Design a protein around this motif. Sequence first.
Motif, mmCIF file in Angstrom:
data_model
loop_
_atom_site.group_PDB
_atom_site.id
_atom_site.type_symbol
_atom_site.label_atom_id
_atom_site.label_comp_id
_atom_site.label_asym_id
_atom_site.label_seq_id
_atom_site.Cartn_x
_atom_site.Cartn_y
_atom_site.Cartn_z
ATOM 1 N N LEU A 56 0.895 -0.075 4.169
ATOM 2 C CA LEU A 56 0.150 -0.726 4.983
ATOM 3 C C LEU A 56 -1.072 -1.573 4.251
ATOM 4 O O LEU A 56 -1.913 -0.968 3.602
ATOM 5 C CB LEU A 56 -0.543 0.164 5.815
ATOM 6 C CG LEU A 56 -1.739 -0.379 6.949
ATOM 7 C CD1 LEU A 56 -1.096 -1.373 7.851
ATOM 8 C CD2 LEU A 56 -2.089 0.902 7.641
ATOM 9 N N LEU A 57 -1.245 -2.888 4.499
ATOM 10 C CA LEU A 57 -1.919 -3.809 3.852
ATOM 11 C C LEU A 57 -2.888 -4.639 4.817
ATOM 12 O O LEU A 57 -2.510 -4.989 5.767
ATOM 13 C CB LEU A 57 -1.015 -4.625 2.982
ATOM 14 C CG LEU A 57 -0.318 -4.041 2.041
ATOM 15 C CD1 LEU A 57 0.647 -5.080 1.132
ATOM 16 C CD2 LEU A 57 -1.019 -3.335 0.938
ATOM 17 N N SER A 58 -3.912 -5.038 4.139
ATOM 18 C CA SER A 58 -5.087 -6.113 4.933
ATOM 19 C C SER A 58 -5.164 -7.171 4.233
ATOM 20 O O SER A 58 -5.324 -7.134 3.101
ATOM 21 C CB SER A 58 -6.301 -5.294 5.284
ATOM 22 O OG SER A 58 -7.037 -6.061 5.728
ATOM 23 N N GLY A 59 -5.058 -8.438 5.041
ATOM 24 C CA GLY A 59 -5.719 -9.627 4.210
ATOM 25 C C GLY A 59 -6.946 -10.143 4.370
ATOM 26 O O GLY A 59 -7.477 -11.070 4.245
ATOM 27 N N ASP A 63 -3.624 1.073 2.753
ATOM 28 C CA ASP A 63 -3.216 1.223 1.148
ATOM 29 C C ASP A 63 -3.918 0.510 0.087
ATOM 30 O O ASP A 63 -4.311 0.695 -0.956
ATOM 31 C CB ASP A 63 -1.723 1.336 0.879
ATOM 32 C CG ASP A 63 -0.975 2.157 1.509
ATOM 33 O OD1 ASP A 63 -1.448 3.453 1.653
ATOM 34 O OD2 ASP A 63 -0.028 2.085 2.326
ATOM 35 N N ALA A 64 -4.206 -0.687 0.855
ATOM 36 C CA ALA A 64 -5.165 -1.829 -0.031
ATOM 37 C C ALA A 64 -5.563 -2.821 1.067
ATOM 38 O O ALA A 64 -4.815 -3.333 1.873
ATOM 39 C CB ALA A 64 -4.051 -2.516 -1.114
ATOM 40 N N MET A 65 -6.371 -3.650 0.387
ATOM 41 C CA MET A 65 -6.972 -4.997 1.114
ATOM 42 C C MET A 65 -7.272 -5.881 0.125
ATOM 43 O O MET A 65 -7.594 -5.664 -0.862
ATOM 44 C CB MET A 65 -8.060 -4.477 1.841
ATOM 45 C CG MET A 65 -9.168 -5.507 2.559
ATOM 46 S SD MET A 65 -10.753 -4.831 3.339
ATOM 47 C CE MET A 65 -11.754 -5.829 2.452
ATOM 48 N N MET A 86 6.738 -10.787 -0.692
ATOM 49 C CA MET A 86 5.976 -11.310 0.292
ATOM 50 C C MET A 86 4.491 -11.684 0.020
ATOM 51 O O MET A 86 3.997 -10.851 -1.022
ATOM 52 C CB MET A 86 6.193 -10.487 1.314
ATOM 53 C CG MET A 86 5.304 -9.363 1.637
ATOM 54 S SD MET A 86 5.654 -8.018 2.894
ATOM 55 C CE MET A 86 5.867 -9.145 4.061
ATOM 56 N N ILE A 87 3.975 -12.417 0.783
ATOM 57 C CA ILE A 87 2.573 -12.699 0.731
ATOM 58 C C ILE A 87 1.950 -12.288 2.093
ATOM 59 O O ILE A 87 2.254 -12.977 3.070
ATOM 60 C CB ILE A 87 2.149 -14.336 0.517
ATOM 61 C CG1 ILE A 87 2.405 -14.685 -1.029
ATOM 62 C CG2 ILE A 87 0.714 -14.461 0.581
ATOM 63 C CD1 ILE A 87 2.536 -16.242 -1.176
ATOM 64 N N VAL A 88 1.248 -11.200 2.003
ATOM 65 C CA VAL A 88 0.652 -10.938 3.354
ATOM 66 C C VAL A 88 -0.925 -11.557 3.447
ATOM 67 O O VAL A 88 -1.730 -11.267 2.697
ATOM 68 C CB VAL A 88 0.276 -9.318 3.374
ATOM 69 C CG1 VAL A 88 -0.740 -8.937 4.314
ATOM 70 C CG2 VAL A 88 1.591 -8.654 3.334
ATOM 71 N N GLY A 89 -1.079 -12.598 4.354
ATOM 72 C CA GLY A 89 -1.947 -13.356 4.436
ATOM 73 C C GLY A 89 -3.153 -13.134 5.411
ATOM 74 O O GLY A 89 -3.260 -12.142 6.205
ATOM 75 N N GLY A 90 -3.956 -14.143 5.337
ATOM 76 C CA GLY A 90 -5.232 -14.209 6.421
ATOM 77 C C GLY A 90 -6.044 -15.399 6.228
ATOM 78 O O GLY A 90 -5.330 -16.479 5.801
ATOM 79 N N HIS A 91 -7.211 -15.347 6.983
ATOM 80 C CA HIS A 91 -8.350 -16.282 6.637
ATOM 81 C C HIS A 91 -7.972 -17.723 7.572
ATOM 82 O O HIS A 91 -8.846 -17.880 8.469
ATOM 83 C CB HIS A 91 -8.161 -17.189 5.467
ATOM 84 C CG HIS A 91 -9.278 -18.173 5.097
ATOM 85 N ND1 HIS A 91 -10.762 -17.684 5.127
ATOM 86 C CD2 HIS A 91 -9.311 -19.434 5.052
ATOM 87 C CE1 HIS A 91 -11.097 -18.944 5.139
ATOM 88 N NE2 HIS A 91 -10.659 -19.811 4.750
#
Length: 525
Positions: free
Chosen positions: A54-57, A85-87, A222-227
């Motif tokens: 489990l990841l955060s952007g 698990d990370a961000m 994959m790229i787990v993204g944001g912004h």
Amino acid sequence: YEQDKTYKITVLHTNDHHGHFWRNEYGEYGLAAQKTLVDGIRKEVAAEGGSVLLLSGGDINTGVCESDLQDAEPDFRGMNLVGYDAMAIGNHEFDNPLTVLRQQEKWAKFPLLSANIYQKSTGERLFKPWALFKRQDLKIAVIGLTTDDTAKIGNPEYFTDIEFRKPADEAKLVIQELQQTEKPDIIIAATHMGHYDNGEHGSNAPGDVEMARALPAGSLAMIVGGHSQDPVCMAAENKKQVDYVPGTPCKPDQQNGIWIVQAHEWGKYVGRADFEFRNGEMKMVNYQLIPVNLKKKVTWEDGKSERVLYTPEIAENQQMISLLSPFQNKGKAQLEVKIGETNGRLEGDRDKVRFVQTNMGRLILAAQMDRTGADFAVMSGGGIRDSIEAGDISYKNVCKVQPFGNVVVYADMTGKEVIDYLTAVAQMKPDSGAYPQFANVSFVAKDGKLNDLKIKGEPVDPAKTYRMATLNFNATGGDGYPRLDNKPGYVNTGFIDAEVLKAYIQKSSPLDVSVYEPKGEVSWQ
Ligand SMILES: [Mn+2]
Ligand SMILES: [Mn+2]
């Protein structure tokens, strides 16, 4: 790993949480429901023999005053309990001094990652660039990246000894590092960079699509993204759905063998990518964006309105409610305290601030001119997020008006530049966020041209220098406003919009709205 054996790995993801630890005023989202959903996925996946990451952007900070007041402590502690698990570090992790970010690393039981942020003086990274995880027999690396727009949008005093390398160039180097040293089976990038259709980033720094196209093919699973704050759900090749609806299919983007996902914002969705790994190959079997108690306003025949769930209800995990309740209650009570008063309603409703000049625009812009010494000012009507009713004004009132942590800026420019600038800004149309609120400006715009242009009631002189205040958002091209951040007279003060408004109210209270009342100084017909 075991040769020819097929491993089930599910990647869960969110981004741009922005202080939404608690459910909203309609019972939507919040981390207590997030936790129930996530635990459920973990149970389902473990029963089939799989693993979860489990990841955060990023962009955990800024956006809900109860969170902001407490430096996002509730949010980071809640994320521990959901089991992140990370961000990736977002730009808003720099809304506070670095020492505050360091204590957020302390609170967080998972790493806050960014490979591309360096201390100038030593040429050393400020943060962990990547982290490693063991899931069944698989070694999985997650790299963190942060948009280099951070240094353009935040407080420059935070960045005098910091540089942001272009994250796409950092990514090539770190992927190669990992491939040569730690030798992970899978690499995923958690990024705070933005998804732009067909890599058309415009005024923004290049983001995820452009990075994926520049990396070696399939080098990231994959790229787990944001912004950008989009649900990355593709209507066609290189085009996201506009007005994506919760509880409908979401096809993630895929560029140069690399999936790109993003789960919109605020804990509204948990994204879920179900993969099978065999001999180094990753195949996506399912992708979805799972709503976390999202709801739609509906009206029955007899006129009764209610908010109905797009999908079945998720119960709030009670361990999360016990952890988070104290923060919510402390925060709410603190922010209800009075900081001044007004003798009239300050109009910030959408149907007004995107159509005509309001007294709320004039109040905000007065606060910004006062802080900067500006002669006049402008902002997007879409940056005014609520009204303030007549009566007592609280900290919460100010937060609702200015929730997003924009920075106040100014530019000294000649009257000739002022003419060109306002002529362009005056073409932004009503019924859009871009619709400009002005202060100390008058004119009649006819045929795209400004007549009787005055600042502070005096005709513009092309040779005279004028100081304009606005936000960092508009100054750097937000809403298509003309860029100011390259003018030699530009200064980014680092003062935060809500702080400036709050202090202005404090020192000006009680407010008499007659002082802030528009009287047709600007008109189009
Ligand atoms: Mn954000
Ligand atoms: Mn951001």
